[PDB]
Amino acid sequence: EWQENKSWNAHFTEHKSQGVVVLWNENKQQGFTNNLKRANQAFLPASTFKIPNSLIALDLGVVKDEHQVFKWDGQTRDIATWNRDHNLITAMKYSVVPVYQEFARQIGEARMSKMLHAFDYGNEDISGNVDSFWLDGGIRISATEQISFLRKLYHNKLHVSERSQRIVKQAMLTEANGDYIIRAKTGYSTRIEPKIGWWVGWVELDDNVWFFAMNMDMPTSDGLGLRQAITKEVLKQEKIIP
Amino acid sequence: EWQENKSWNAHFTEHKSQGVVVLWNENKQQGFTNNLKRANQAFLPASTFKIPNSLIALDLGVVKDEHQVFKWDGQTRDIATWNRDHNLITAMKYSVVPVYQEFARQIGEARMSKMLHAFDYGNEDISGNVDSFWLDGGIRISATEQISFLRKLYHNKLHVSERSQRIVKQAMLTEANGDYIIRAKTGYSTRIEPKIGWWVGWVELDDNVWFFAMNMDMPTSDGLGLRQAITKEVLKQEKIIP
Ligand SMILES: *C(=O)[C@@H]([C@@H]1NC(C(=O)O)=C(S[C@@H]2CN[C@H](CNS(N)(=O)=O)C2)[C@@H]1C)[C@@H](C)O
Ligand SMILES: C[C@@H](O)[C@@H](C=O)[C@@H]1NC(C(=O)O)=C(S[C@@H]2CN[C@H](CNS(N)(=O)=O)C2)[C@@H]1C
Ligand SMILES: C[C@@H](O)[C@H]1C(=O)N2C(C(=O)O)=C(S[C@@H]3CN[C@H](CNS(N)(=O)=O)C3)[C@H](C)[C@H]12
Ligand SMILES: C[C@@H](O)[C@H]1C(=O)N2C(C(=O)O)=C(S[C@@H]3CN[C@H](CNS(N)(=O)=O)C3)[C@H](C)[C@H]12
Ligand SMILES: [Ca+2]
Ligand SMILES: [Ca+2]
Ligand SMILES: [Ca+2]
Ligand SMILES: [Cl-]
Ligand SMILES: [Cl-]
Ligand SMILES: [Cl-]
Ligand SMILES: [Cl-]
Incomplete structure (x- = not known):
């Protein structure tokens, strides 16, 4: 259904952050997340x-x-x-x-x-x-x-x-190279608590598409670069991107 | 108008190559090349x-x-x-x-x-x-x-x-990042002399589009990477990409 791989929590932990990353493998029709509760x-x-x-x-x-x-x-x-x-x-x-x-x-x-x-x-x-x-x-x-x-x-x-x-x-379109194409959109919700940052989109490969949606607690504008960084650590850990 | 910029030839000669790069500034409706004759x-x-x-x-x-x-x-x-x-x-x-x-x-x-x-x-x-x-x-x-x-x-x-x-x-789609988007296509003509390599396409900026077309002598397949390399050095020299 949706597998919980808590080893992803390390990537939030190292950067002193709380949040969720969700991936969907389109070929395999299988989803993955570090936190099923926050995912929903x-x-x-x-x-x-x-x-x-x-x-x-x-x-x-x-x-x-x-x-x-x-x-x-x-x-x-x-x-x-x-x-x-x-x-x-x-x-x-x-x-x-x-x-x-x-x-x-x-x-x-x-x-x-x-x-x-x-x-x-x-x-x-x-x-x-x-x-x-x-x-x-x-x-x-x-x-x-x-x-x-x-x-x-x-x-x-x-x-x-x-x-x-x-x-x-x-x-x-956000990024493209010989290995992948990312189409995505960031967001930062501040007007109502909790303050959170978003990154949602998908990664296009030769043979598959990996959809993603992440959000994380974002008290200050400081940590905004972590939205893409943490997602990409996860993608790399799963060997989706080189 | 078509302006000749012979200074771009330094990028062919440093790679023991000969060829032509043609650029077109869409906003200005102006073209630039190192070799007007070969461009045509x-x-x-x-x-x-x-x-x-x-x-x-x-x-x-x-x-x-x-x-x-x-x-x-x-x-x-x-x-x-x-x-x-x-x-x-x-x-x-x-x-x-x-x-x-x-x-x-x-x-x-x-x-x-x-x-x-x-x-x-x-x-x-x-x-x-x-x-x-x-x-x-x-x-x-x-x-x-x-x-x-x-x-x-x-x-x-x-x-x-x-x-x-x-x-x-x-x-x-070939490459994209926060500075530019490149849509392009390579070619390698070998069946009839002279052996040449092609790279044609354009660079999308926030406020302009720069079209390009280059070809270069290609006696062996080992120089194929020079198509992109030399084009990008000309784009960098002209400050079209960082
Ligand atoms: C089309 O011109 C031709 C294709 N196209 C190309 C090309 O590079 O434009 C080739 S090159 C051939 C395939 N990839 C090898 C080189 N790898 S790399 N990374 O580019 O150095 C050699 C091929 C001949 C068709 C019509 O044959
Ligand atoms: C509510 C809306 O105002 C908000 C809703 O998304 C907007 N959307 C987004 C977004 O995240 O896409 C931003 S980001 C903004 C641009 N410059 C700073 C970032 N500097 S950095 N380098 O990231 O630290 C803040 C807006 C605030
Ligand atoms: C080189 C190209 O061929 C690429 C392409 O396309 N590939 C796919 C794909 O097809 O997904 C992947 S992803 C990778 C393989 N499997 C791992 C997890 N799979 S799993 N059990 O988590 O679902 C992650 C590679 C990037 C390869
Ligand atoms: C910062 C973004 O907004 C970018 C964008 O868009 N820019 C344009 C453009 O609009 O072309 C250029 S190109 C650069 C400026 N002029 C030189 C040649 N000029 S010229 N007379 O030789 O043709 C090369 C920048 C990358 C800037
Ligand atoms: Ca409904
Ligand atoms: Ca050079
Ligand atoms: Ca035939
Ligand atoms: Cl549907
Ligand atoms: Cl908005
Ligand atoms: Cl596209
Ligand atoms: Cl073909």
Whole structure:
């Protein structure tokens, strides 16, 4: 079903961290985690919500394609990379929240709810402000539920156009070399306790796909680099990446 | 305009090589090369023809998607890479000429010809064997012509479905990190003199795209790695990648 390999807890232990890593072997239809309980604990998605938000925007024509330019609104915000024009690729890369809050308002409460239900996304609850519910509203998703959603996206099985799903998977591209391709999205939920960081996505190999979703306790912005580092220690331990 | 930059030749001579690198700044609509004459010299495309071949195969339904398996059909025909199953992703990556021979036979010469004329691909000539003309037939393409073709592909402007162009560009993924994305294709022309190696594609930045096409004399297979090496040194020299 889902095997618990607690030897992964060493990688959180060394870095003085608490969290969960979940892997899914698509060929073998087998899942692995260091913590079955935390694997199914549901949290705010934070910026991991940029994946379904992007899909819905594209499917509804709110975003025409990955080249459409979203003008900086002229408000100088805290993250310098947000203070400029963006397309879908760079808004995903730099996790540009204002662009996605605009997407959400144009999508609207009713279409957003209907799509999240169509997606079976987390708890399907978008209570709160239409442009912030994934930050401080009622939506919740677990690491295992992220995998479930991502597997559909990978197979083009979500109830949106194939084109939307291909564009979003292009925009998720994070790293690629001769050994693997990673498509993924980070998140950091701070507006409601507990403060946690996310990394969800998958690793594409020649012959298989390994889906992953991790989250960890993140009191300060210090440990944000550990989201990718710990996941990759796990991947390396299992010899998924060289 | 086309600017000549002879200073790039230092990267060929230090490797006891001769060749041409062509770069195109999409934003500026400006091209750069070390050798204007060789930049326009037309050669057999060899494995770089996998780009138009895959596009046509997908557009015509010869290949259903990037997951369809092409089974090994017994033959252990010397090359080990061709001793296993493939899909479009892996067949682009590795030398598996029987798979692309099968595409071309199914496409057939009438539609192959029509498509290469619609692509304005090289000298638009498919004379020779329908299952090998890109290796030993009459088709020829120059580095500048590779750029013209790739630019259309990047803009989804070729006269095939948008979906087929998106899939081939996925299959072209070679390298990606926080600084750049490279989509590209190698080639090695040996069946007709002169023996040459190819590397064609583009570099996606946050705010621009740099297309490239290089070829270089390749008297033996031991210099194949110099295709990527020399191209990347020219990109680094120009500060396109760090
Ligand atoms: C297509 O041009 C040709 C393929 N393509 C290539 C190529 O390198 O572009 C080759 S090279 C052959 C297979 N891999 C060996 C080299 N390994 S490496 N890591 O690149 O040094 C030798 C092959 C000839 C088809 C049409 O034959
Ligand atoms: C709620 C939203 O504000 C939040 C929700 O995800 C946003 N999404 C993400 C994310 O994690 O993708 C970030 S990260 C941000 C960029 N610069 C700092 C990081 N420096 S480092 N090098 O990592 O220490 C913090 C935002 C805070
Ligand atoms: C070199 C290419 O061929 C790669 C590819 O593709 N490979 C697969 C795969 O197919 O998954 C793996 S993963 C690795 C093998 N098995 C271990 C755990 N398996 S297990 N019992 O935990 O499920 C991890 C390799 C990277 C190999
Ligand atoms: C930091 C990111 O935003 C990157 C991006 O995007 N950038 C562009 C671009 O926009 O091309 C470049 S390239 C570099 C600047 N100019 C030189 C050649 N100029 S020139 N006149 O010879 O063509 C090479 C940077 C990598 C920067
Ligand atoms: Ca449901
Ligand atoms: Ca050099
Ligand atoms: Ca033949
Ligand atoms: Cl967001
Ligand atoms: Cl499903
Ligand atoms: Cl070929
Ligand atoms: Cl991609």
